[PDB]
Design an enzyme around this catalytic site. Sequence first.
Site, PDB file in Angstrom:
ATOM      1  N   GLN A   1       0.786  -1.227   0.000  1.00 49.06           N
ATOM      2  CA  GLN A   1       0.000   0.000   0.000  1.00 49.06           C
ATOM      3  C   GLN A   1       0.819   1.278   0.000  1.00 49.06           C
ATOM      4  O   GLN A   1       0.306   2.331  -0.377  1.00 49.06           O
ATOM      5  CB  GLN A   1      -0.977   0.011   1.187  1.00 49.06           C
ATOM      6  CG  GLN A   1      -0.368   0.376   2.528  1.00 49.06           C
ATOM      7  CD  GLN A   1      -1.381   0.256   3.654  1.00 49.06           C
ATOM      8  OE1 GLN A   1      -1.891  -0.827   3.927  1.00 49.06           O
ATOM      9  NE2 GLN A   1      -1.687   1.371   4.303  1.00 49.06           N
TER      10      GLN A   1
ATOM     11  N   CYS B   1      -5.392   0.473   3.499  1.00 45.52           N
ATOM     12  CA  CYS B   1      -5.521  -0.876   4.032  1.00 45.52           C
ATOM     13  C   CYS B   1      -6.969  -1.372   3.907  1.00 45.52           C
ATOM     14  O   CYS B   1      -7.213  -2.531   3.567  1.00 45.52           O
ATOM     15  CB  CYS B   1      -5.090  -0.904   5.502  1.00 45.52           C
ATOM     16  SG  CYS B   1      -6.110   0.175   6.555  1.00 45.52           S
TER      17      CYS B   1
ATOM     18  N   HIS C   1      -6.392  -0.823  11.811  1.00 44.11           N
ATOM     19  CA  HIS C   1      -5.825  -1.301  10.540  1.00 44.11           C
ATOM     20  C   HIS C   1      -6.651  -2.412   9.878  1.00 44.11           C
ATOM     21  O   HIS C   1      -6.916  -3.431  10.496  1.00 44.11           O
ATOM     22  CB  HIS C   1      -4.379  -1.784  10.806  1.00 44.11           C
ATOM     23  CG  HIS C   1      -3.621  -2.194   9.574  1.00 44.11           C
ATOM     24  ND1 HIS C   1      -3.527  -1.398   8.451  1.00 44.11           N
ATOM     25  CD2 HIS C   1      -2.893  -3.305   9.311  1.00 44.11           C
ATOM     26  CE1 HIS C   1      -2.774  -2.005   7.548  1.00 44.11           C
ATOM     27  NE2 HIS C   1      -2.377  -3.164   8.044  1.00 44.11           N
TER      28      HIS C   1
ATOM     29  N   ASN D   1      -1.658  -9.105   5.273  1.00 41.77           N
ATOM     30  CA  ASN D   1      -1.471  -7.657   5.420  1.00 41.77           C
ATOM     31  C   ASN D   1      -1.241  -7.037   4.031  1.00 41.77           C
ATOM     32  O   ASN D   1      -1.195  -7.755   3.032  1.00 41.77           O
ATOM     33  CB  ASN D   1      -0.260  -7.392   6.331  1.00 41.77           C
ATOM     34  CG  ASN D   1      -0.227  -5.968   6.862  1.00 41.77           C
ATOM     35  OD1 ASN D   1      -1.160  -5.198   6.659  1.00 41.77           O
ATOM     36  ND2 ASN D   1       0.857  -5.614   7.544  1.00 41.77           N
TER      37      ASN D   1
HETATM   38  C1  LIG Z   1      -5.453   4.212   7.285  1.00 37.84           C
HETATM   39  C2  LIG Z   1      -5.465   2.747   7.772  1.00 37.84           C
HETATM   40  C3  LIG Z   1      -5.239   1.869   6.571  1.00 37.84           C
HETATM   41  N1  LIG Z   1      -4.181   1.890   5.768  1.00 37.84           N
HETATM   42  C4  LIG Z   1      -4.256   2.565   8.677  1.00 37.84           C
HETATM   43  O1  LIG Z   1      -4.460   3.240   9.903  1.00 37.84           O
HETATM   44  C5  LIG Z   1      -3.255   3.840  10.377  1.00 37.84           C
HETATM   45  C6  LIG Z   1      -2.239   2.778  10.664  1.00 37.84           C
HETATM   46  C7  LIG Z   1      -0.892   3.018  10.441  1.00 37.84           C
HETATM   47  C8  LIG Z   1       0.053   2.044  10.710  1.00 37.84           C
HETATM   48  C9  LIG Z   1      -0.342   0.814  11.202  1.00 37.84           C
HETATM   49  C10 LIG Z   1      -1.690   0.556  11.427  1.00 37.84           C
HETATM   50  C11 LIG Z   1      -2.629   1.537  11.155  1.00 37.84           C
HETATM   51  N2  LIG Z   1      -6.713   2.460   8.520  1.00 37.84           N
HETATM   52  C12 LIG Z   1      -7.936   2.537   7.985  1.00 37.84           C
HETATM   53  O2  LIG Z   1      -8.124   2.788   6.797  1.00 37.84           O
HETATM   54  C13 LIG Z   1      -9.132   2.272   8.938  1.00 37.84           C
HETATM   55  C14 LIG Z   1      -9.730   0.882   8.668  1.00 37.84           C
HETATM   56  C15 LIG Z   1     -10.956   0.495   9.509  1.00 37.84           C
HETATM   57  C16 LIG Z   1     -11.383  -0.957   9.246  1.00 37.84           C
HETATM   58  C17 LIG Z   1     -12.593  -1.385  10.085  1.00 37.84           C
HETATM   59  C18 LIG Z   1     -12.342  -1.177  11.570  1.00 37.84           C
HETATM   60  C19 LIG Z   1     -11.856   0.245  11.873  1.00 37.84           C
HETATM   61  C20 LIG Z   1     -10.647   0.613  11.001  1.00 37.84           C
HETATM   62  N3  LIG Z   1     -10.159   3.327   8.781  1.00 37.84           N
HETATM   63  C21 LIG Z   1      -9.883   4.596   9.105  1.00 37.84           C
HETATM   64  O3  LIG Z   1      -8.782   4.889   9.586  1.00 37.84           O
HETATM   65  N4  LIG Z   1     -10.865   5.539   8.905  1.00 37.84           N
HETATM   66  C22 LIG Z   1     -12.268   5.218   8.602  1.00 37.84           C
HETATM   67  C23 LIG Z   1     -12.910   6.250   7.652  1.00 37.84           C
HETATM   68  O4  LIG Z   1     -12.650   7.577   8.098  1.00 37.84           O
HETATM   69  C24 LIG Z   1     -11.261   7.873   8.069  1.00 37.84           C
HETATM   70  C25 LIG Z   1     -10.515   6.961   9.041  1.00 37.84           C
END
Ligand SMILES: C[C@@](C#N)(COCc1ccccc1)NC(=O)[C@H](CC1CCCCC1)NC(=O)N1CCOCC1
EC number: 3.4.22.27
Length: 217
Positions: free
Chosen positions: A19, A25, A164, A184
């Site tokens: 990604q 993710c 994540h 992942n």
């Molecule tokens: C951006 C992210 C993806 N890519 C990584 O998050 C930051 C991160 C960085 C390093 C390690 C782990 C996580 N996450 C998301 O997209 C998560 C996934 C979601 C899946 C279902 C359960 C809750 C979480 N969503 C998320 O962050 N948002 C949801 C929509 O509004 C914006 C924020």
Amino acid sequence: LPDSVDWREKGCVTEVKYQGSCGACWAFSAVGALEAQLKLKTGKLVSLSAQNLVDCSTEKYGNKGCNGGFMTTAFQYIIDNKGIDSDASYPYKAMDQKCQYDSKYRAATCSKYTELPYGREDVLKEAVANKGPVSVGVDARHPSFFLYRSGVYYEPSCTQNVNHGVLVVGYGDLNGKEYWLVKNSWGHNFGEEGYIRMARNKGNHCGIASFPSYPEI
Ligand SMILES: C[C@@](C#N)(COCc1ccccc1)NC(=O)[C@H](CC1CCCCC1)NC(=O)N1CCOCC1
């Protein structure tokens, strides 16, 4: 239920994707789950466009592209849209782009999705065994998560506050430790060629069974 499951052995899991610096993710989690269903239905294993989701399943779906999203709303976008393009036709650029969906490049459709009951690891086991890979969210913000290399991941500091999006493609037992086999999207350099075995039946460790869902065709 079978004692262990590995959807990779059934040719239902595509290559691990990278990604990059785009928080997609959720998109990778969603296409991975649909890819398995597509294979099960048509016999063909095809990577689907995570970018398509990034660029198109946006505001109306509560998603923010490279800044985060949800697997369930992505699924609904595919349903509403009547399709999703192939990864080959709509390549991943790790950037927010204008929606460029074209049905001429459609590689899959979705008719519905199911969200599993919160924190029930037995229900998740049943779904993984009877339906296929399941999209889930895990708490991956702990330093130990990035440095995982082998064995079964167990982090005392983990929580059920998930952040994540990843994909459960199986489960089993390794040296007496039950685990969830997780795909992942940080490339092959991460963990075990892009995968991580996360503790199973250890009180919903890292929130793995907190928010599971899977699509159907
Ligand atoms: C951006 C992210 C993806 N890519 C990584 O998050 C930051 C991160 C960085 C390093 C390690 C782990 C996580 N996450 C998301 O997209 C998560 C996934 C979601 C899946 C279902 C359960 C809750 C979480 N969503 C998320 O962050 N948002 C949801 C929509 O509004 C914006 C924020």
